[PDB]
Every structure is written in structure tokens, then in C-alpha cells.
């Protein structure tokens, strides 16, 4: 993540669910951003400090250990790790889906990558992944 001018390769790659949930620092599961009245990020929402880092340098959501001397530790009650307020620029989240979902680029962009991998026509694969037709995936 953080290094020096040491550079020899930039490797792109298709990511996997284990990689995503290893990337993330928390699991956002509420469709809220800010409390309308106090104008502070909600807990467990799209902008929660516990998941995405403080908005205030060396400060915590419940004002427990707001000082540099307290760094790297997590405030036990509110749960917001105390650090600099630019980790929000970098820390990511993840959403665990109750149902797997196909990526769009590899389905729709002509030529269809799933179509070529599974030897399926796009016209008939849309009917599958959009719940318009069934698919037999095994035979005895």
C-alpha cells in the first residue's frame, strides 16, 4: 500500500471475494450517511467512523482518547480507531450479498466473456442471469 519509488510491475488482476473481504475494514450494512440533526456520520452506515476511519485527526466518535499519545488504539465503546483523519481517503468497505451476482463487464460487453467461457449465447444468458429462464447445471 505505502512504499517508496521501488517499482518494477503494475499487475492488474481479476479479484475474488476472499480478496475483497480481506481488503475491507468493515461491513457496511445500513443505507444511511449522516444524522440529519447533529450532522455526524451514522454507525454502520456508508460513512461510519468505525469502518472508514475518523473524520477528525486523533479523535474518536465518543471523545474518549482524543490525542496523539492515544494512536493506533481503538476506543472500546464507540469503536473508532484513533488516527489521522486522512485514512478515510483510503480505507474501503464491503457489502456481503445475500445472493451472488454476476459482474456486468464480463456479461454484457461484446464479446461476452461468460458467453465464450460457458459456450452460451448472450441472448440466452441474459434470460438466465435476469431470472427469465432456468438452466440445467448437472445431469446424471
Amino acid at each position: 500500500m505505502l512504499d517508496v519509488n521501488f517499482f518494477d510491475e503494475l499487475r492488474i488482476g481479476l479479484a475474488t471475494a476472499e480478496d475483497i473481504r480481506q481488503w475491507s475494514y468493515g461491513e457496511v450494512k445500513k443505507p444511511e450517511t449522516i444524522n440529519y440533526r447533529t450532522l455526524k456520520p451514522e454507525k454502520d452506515g456508508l460513512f461510519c467512523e468505525k469502518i472508514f476511519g475518523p473524520t477528525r485527526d486523533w479523535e474518536c466518535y465518543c471523545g474518549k482518547y482524543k490525542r496523539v499519545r492515544f494512536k493506533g488504539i481503538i476506543c472500546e465503546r464507540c469503536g473508532v480507531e484513533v488516527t489521522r483523519a486522512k485514512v478515510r481517503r483510503e480505507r474501503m468497505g464491503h457489502i456481503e450479498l445475500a445472493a451472488p451476482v454476476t459482474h456486468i463487464w464480463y456479461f454484457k460487453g461484446v464479446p461476452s466473456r461468460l458467453g465464450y467461457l460457458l459456450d452460451l449465447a448472450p441472448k440466452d444468458l441474459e434470460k438466465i442471469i435476469y431470472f427469465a429462464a432456468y438452466v440445467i447445471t448437472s445431469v446424471d
Binding site: 450532522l39 455526524k40 468505525k50 473524520t55 477528525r56 485527526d57 486523533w58 479523535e59 482518547y65 496523539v68 499519545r69 492515544f70 494512536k71 493506533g72 488504539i73 481503538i74 472500546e76 469503536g79 483523519a85
Partner: protein
């Protein structure tokens, strides 16, 4: 036309000289996974934690 954020500049650079003495706690999940969270000397460790 401008804007701001509810943040603290806290111009303090960094200090590795004195770090509020802190141990590290660990709360294993339901599937054999461990996620260490550091806690201070004065920290009151929870019985269980959101890992």
C-alpha cells in the same frame, strides 16, 4: 463558493517517542478467525467485540 469538513487539522506531524502504553486484545470469530485490536493499558477490554 467553498466547503469544509468536520475534521481536525491537529498540526502535530507524528511522534514515535511516547506511545500511550498499550497491549493487544484478540476476539476470535465464529469460524476460527482471529482479528487483533490493540488496547491501551487503561483500556477496559470488552467481553466480545465487533471484529
Amino acid at each position: 463558493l467553498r466547503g469544509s469538513r468536520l475534521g481536525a487539522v491537529s498540526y502535530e506531524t507524528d511522534r514515535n517517542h511516547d506511545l500511550a502504553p498499550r497491549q493487544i486484545a484478540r476476539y476470535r470469530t465464529d469460524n476460527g478467525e482471529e482479528f487483533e485490536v490493540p488496547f491501551a493499558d487503561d483500556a477496559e477490554i470488552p467481553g466480545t467485540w465487533l471484529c
